[PDB]
Write an enzyme that holds these catalytic residues in place. Structure first.
Site, mmCIF file in Angstrom:
data_model
loop_
_atom_site.group_PDB
_atom_site.id
_atom_site.type_symbol
_atom_site.label_atom_id
_atom_site.label_comp_id
_atom_site.label_asym_id
_atom_site.label_seq_id
_atom_site.Cartn_x
_atom_site.Cartn_y
_atom_site.Cartn_z
ATOM 1 N N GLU A 235 -58.712 32.730 -10.199
ATOM 2 C CA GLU A 235 -58.188 33.937 -9.507
ATOM 3 C C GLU A 235 -59.214 35.077 -9.376
ATOM 4 O O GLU A 235 -59.011 36.175 -9.925
ATOM 5 C CB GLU A 235 -56.887 34.401 -10.179
ATOM 6 C CG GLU A 235 -55.839 33.313 -10.040
ATOM 7 C CD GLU A 235 -54.469 33.522 -10.641
ATOM 8 O OE1 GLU A 235 -54.306 34.451 -11.463
ATOM 9 O OE2 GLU A 235 -53.555 32.735 -10.298
ATOM 10 N N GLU A 340 -52.983 25.271 -9.726
ATOM 11 C CA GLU A 340 -52.124 25.979 -10.704
ATOM 12 C C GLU A 340 -50.792 26.368 -10.144
ATOM 13 O O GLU A 340 -50.729 26.933 -9.064
ATOM 14 C CB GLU A 340 -52.812 27.264 -11.298
ATOM 15 C CG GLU A 340 -52.126 27.795 -12.566
ATOM 16 C CD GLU A 340 -52.682 29.139 -12.993
ATOM 17 O OE1 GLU A 340 -53.866 29.197 -13.397
ATOM 18 O OE2 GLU A 340 -51.934 30.137 -12.929
ATOM 19 N N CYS A 342 -46.642 27.645 -11.978
ATOM 20 C CA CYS A 342 -45.634 27.795 -13.018
ATOM 21 C C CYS A 342 -44.511 28.683 -12.493
ATOM 22 O O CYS A 342 -44.733 29.501 -11.593
ATOM 23 C CB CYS A 342 -46.194 28.299 -14.355
ATOM 24 S SG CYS A 342 -46.559 30.071 -14.395
ATOM 25 N N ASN A 370 -47.410 20.974 0.325
ATOM 26 C CA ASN A 370 -48.850 20.853 0.125
ATOM 27 C C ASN A 370 -49.330 19.511 0.687
ATOM 28 O O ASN A 370 -50.271 19.490 1.492
ATOM 29 C CB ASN A 370 -49.172 20.950 -1.353
ATOM 30 C CG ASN A 370 -49.417 22.364 -1.811
ATOM 31 O OD1 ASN A 370 -50.410 22.965 -1.487
ATOM 32 N ND2 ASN A 370 -48.531 22.916 -2.594
#
Ligand SMILES: *[C@@H]1O[C@H](CO)[C@@H](O[C@@H]2O[C@H](CO)[C@@H](O)[C@H](O)[C@H]2NC(C)=O)[C@H](O)[C@H]1NC(C)=O
Ligand code: M7H
Ligand code: NAG
Ligand code: CL
EC number: 3.2.1.45
Lengths: 497, 494
Positions: A235, A340, A342, A370
């Site tokens: 990030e 990533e 969550c 995706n």
């Protein structure tokens, strides 16, 4: 082989309870005859990757929804699926008794489980660490003379990664990502908050930081661990925000572009780890295609970049077609990889919602979208968390597909585990996404792929409350007549000629 | 007229301290002279200086050329929201401190706000849940009434704000939730929309609620410029959405406007009130505008598209505002709410944050460069925790009130907003402004209704940037934009 022991925690679905002597598992794959299919089904009502079989018919008469396979329409090849070996995940797993640890690792990594083939490894501390540290905390150690792995690596992450690879069905690919550099290399002299590397690309600070990646890779190689890829920074846009609370290191796309061209790229290429892939971005897809254009239009930077890593947090604000689709159109030779994800991080969210079907559906909806937009793999975050969604040094508590209850020597496999497994177990590395067209507008999410051996895989997610009668057509085998129940996910497998 | 009393709280810049007896305040030069108002991270707060505009300029340095015949959008204005939280914080100060706070925002000695956003009943920046028609199954809205929040807090404060303003002030109303007996989930929050379908008793009652609201405020001698179709309609589509919301997909909003809201407002004595659509994250465009504005029945009632701006998102405005304007150039874009952070996660107040000031001004420039006619901040004033807020959804505000010291702090955000609001009156028009070479500056040029020029220059870099502003009618403006500075230039063109 062993069914799910269901437990309701009062949410929309059940968890599967595992302990030192029991965990649900699969039997080895059987090879169903040409003209028949296999179906694995999970439902909100409680079914967990249950196997059934049926016929593929030569004919079909009806006006119902038809999904037509287009095996000659070839798209991306799959790298894989997995999760992150954070300090929090490693601590939790290792606090279980050894037989419970092996059942948890087999659930993720073995053929008796869901066949993960990706492990994301943070480079030193990140929010799911219980403390802040880097591998080079002696101030102004430009030579990296005091670079070393603390017990978080040598006693927790590294032993568990070895155990996961020993149990794995398939070759496992390790992905490394750094959150912060040592503080003495940063403009703000802190692990978090707004701050970048001091100076400019090509200088002493940027050269030391690129060497830190080689030192990390050297230290893991001394522990018999080899990486498939590294990201240029976790990030990087987070480090540009004042008050950013987690370990970070800010890069604008221009700064990332120049650091890769002048420092990271050449340092990696001139090391024994030149085969390690470099992924750029490792951030929200809302930064696409702009970040890819800045980095990949510079040939000095582009020559070192293998792929683009994306995080899922702003997917609901960043239409896939405009971000992933346009990035692929512009740079078709640079792979897109989801690194990533969550649930549970929003301000009002309950960190862990044991048995949440909604959280499972969020995972499979993300994976399907995706895959429909050229992405080659999908990576979860923490492999395991405690019932509070921790530990974490900054009170950022979130959910995880496996929840460890240390006092009970028990772990719970959430709907996210099974939603992820509907993909990871059945889509090995080298599988290729193929065309799949619908006869009419519908509420289902579906994707079709072909295994390296030529067999077909179709995942069908139904996020609506209504059962949807469905037909899948393979132009060489026939019609698979089925029903997609409300709040279900199915994986269909079948042999081809 | 009174300088900033600076105070540091350990952040990048200072706040300006105001109390019951003190607050910093303000006081056009002849043709051939320019005015410069400068604010710096080092402490300068909209300091006035002047200089010559010279007939000739020789050099290779950065040149920003004014293009007066390149005309864009006309400005509606600037302001902020009179939430329950804003009103409680202001009324917590002694009356002389309240008046200096209100003069800071609304008077000409202040930053001349001409827009006030008014929530229709409760939101997260409230101390309790409530609507104007909580008595169940009152479809005729016979028990519709304004509570203490409006009659004792908001309405008296808006009245005091209009008294202090020299510029006509425009009021904008937005609902967060309907009465729960009109909702599919029967709750103030969570995932839920209006019961049934557009044209029915539930949608008709909800349209009538807007008229009842406008009727109630009209009895308090308050008229509205515009209403929005719903605050953040995407929020009520989220399972477990934590606070007041009312879900609408773009299709549902399109049909409610076409069948109920539009005809109801048009058939009422408030038919002149403008109706704004979306009132949600700009990131939902162009999709949302394409769905609503392609329906002719909905299009005939929609005056404009209200957008929200959460300042942590890094995205190209061309993709949202740019594309929406390209598709619907005759439908105005207006920023109805802006604030720091990312909406769904958490933030804290950073007293004296220059970074947050720069986010505001950078955002206003981006909006104006992408056809937006106005910019509305969120809460006008918050306490030091960024509240009160009944779901702890704290955020920063340009003015922070400290009840215990009967003091209020004016943040860099206040001054970054002021560099626009004080110098860009309603009716001003954005004009072309071209750079000679690629640069680190954020700049916008506008023309006042009287023909005078206003140029806002923001320097987000650490380096001092020398520059020249060329106006073909007057000559050249020779200046330097210091690192981490914001300047507003003013000059007569004739
Ligand atoms: C581990 O989990 C298994 C599965 O739920 C538990 O096994 C059950 O135990 C009860 C009580 O002894 C028996 O009546 C059931 O027949 C068992 N079920 C199965 C499928 O074997 C086991 O007891 C758990 N262990 C601990 C220590 O809690
Ligand atoms: C102090 O406690 C806490 C502090 C912070 C947190 C916490 C946890 N998760 C978070 C955030 C912010 C985000 C978003 C913001 C928007 N995005 C951008 C702009 O790229 C994507 C990332 N995530 C996903 N904050 C939780 C707890
Ligand atoms: C108010 O602020 C002024 C200026 O700093 C100061 O002189 C005065 O003492 C303050 N009043 C109170 C009551 O603190
Ligand atoms: Cl936004």
């Amino acid at each position: 082989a062993r069914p799910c022991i269901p437990k309701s925690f009062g949410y929309s679905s059940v968890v599967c309870v595992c302990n030192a002597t029991y965990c649900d598992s699969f039997d080895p794959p059987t090879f169903p005859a040409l003209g028949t299919f296999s179906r694995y089904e999970s439902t909100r009502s409680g079914r967990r990757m249950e196997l059934s079989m049926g016929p593929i018919q030569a004919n079909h008469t009806g006006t119902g929804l038809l999904l037509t396979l287009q095996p000659e329409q070839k798209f991306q090849k799959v790298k894989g699926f997995g999760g992150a070996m954070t300090d929090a995940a490693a601590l939790n797993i290792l606090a279980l008794s050894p037989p419970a640890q092996n059942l948890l690792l087999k659930s993720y990594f073995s053929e008796e489980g869901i066949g993960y083939n990706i492990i994301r490894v943070p480079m030193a501390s990140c929010d799911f660490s219980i403390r802040t540290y880097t591998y080079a905390d002696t101030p102004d150690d430009f030579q990296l003379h005091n670079f070393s792995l603390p017990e978080e690596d040598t006693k927790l992450k590294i032993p568990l990664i070895h155990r996961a690879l020993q149990l794995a069905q398939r070759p496992v690919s390790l992905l490394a990502s750094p959150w912060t550099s040592p503080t003495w290399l940063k403009t703000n002299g802190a692990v978090n908050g707004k701050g970048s590397l001091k100076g400019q690309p090509g200088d002493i600070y940027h050269q030391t930081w690129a060497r830190y990646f080689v030192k990390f890779l050297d230290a893991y190689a001394e522990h018999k661990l080899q990486f498939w890829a590294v990201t240029a920074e976790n990030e990087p846009s987070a480090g540009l925000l004042s008050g950013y609370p987690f370990q970070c290191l800010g890069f604008t796309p221009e700064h990332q572009r120049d650091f890769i061209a002048r420092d990271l790229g050449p340092t990696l290429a001139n090391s024994t780890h030149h085969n390690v892939r470099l992924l750029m971005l490792d951030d929200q897809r809302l930064l696409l295609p702009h970040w890819a254009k800045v980095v990949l239009t510079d040939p000095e930077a582009a020559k070192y970049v293998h792929g683009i890593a994306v995080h899922w947090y702003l997917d609901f604000l960043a239409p896939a077609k405009a971000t992933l689709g346009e990035t692929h159109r512009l740079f078709p030779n640079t792979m897109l990889f989801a690194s990533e994800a969550c649930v549970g991080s929003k301000f009002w969210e309950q960190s862990v919602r044991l048995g949440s079907w909604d959280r499972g559906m969020q995972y499979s909806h993300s994976i399907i979208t995706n895959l429909l937009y050229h992405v080659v793999g999908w990576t979860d975050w923490n492999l395991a968390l405690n019932p509070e969604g921790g530990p974490n040094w900054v009170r950022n508590f979130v959910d995880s597909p496996i929840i460890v209850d240390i006092t009970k020597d028990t772990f719970y496999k959430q709907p996210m585990f099974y939603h992820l497994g509907h993909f990871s177990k059945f889509i090995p590395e080298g599988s290729q996404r193929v065309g799949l067209v619908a006869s009419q507008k519908n509420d289902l999410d579906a994707v079709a792929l072909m295994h390296p051996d030529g067999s077909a895989v179709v995942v069908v997610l139904n996020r609506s409350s209504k059962d949807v009668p469905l037909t899948i057509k393979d132009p060489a085998v026939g019609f698979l007549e089925t029903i997609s129940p409300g709040y279900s996910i199915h994986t269909y497998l079948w042999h081809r000629q």
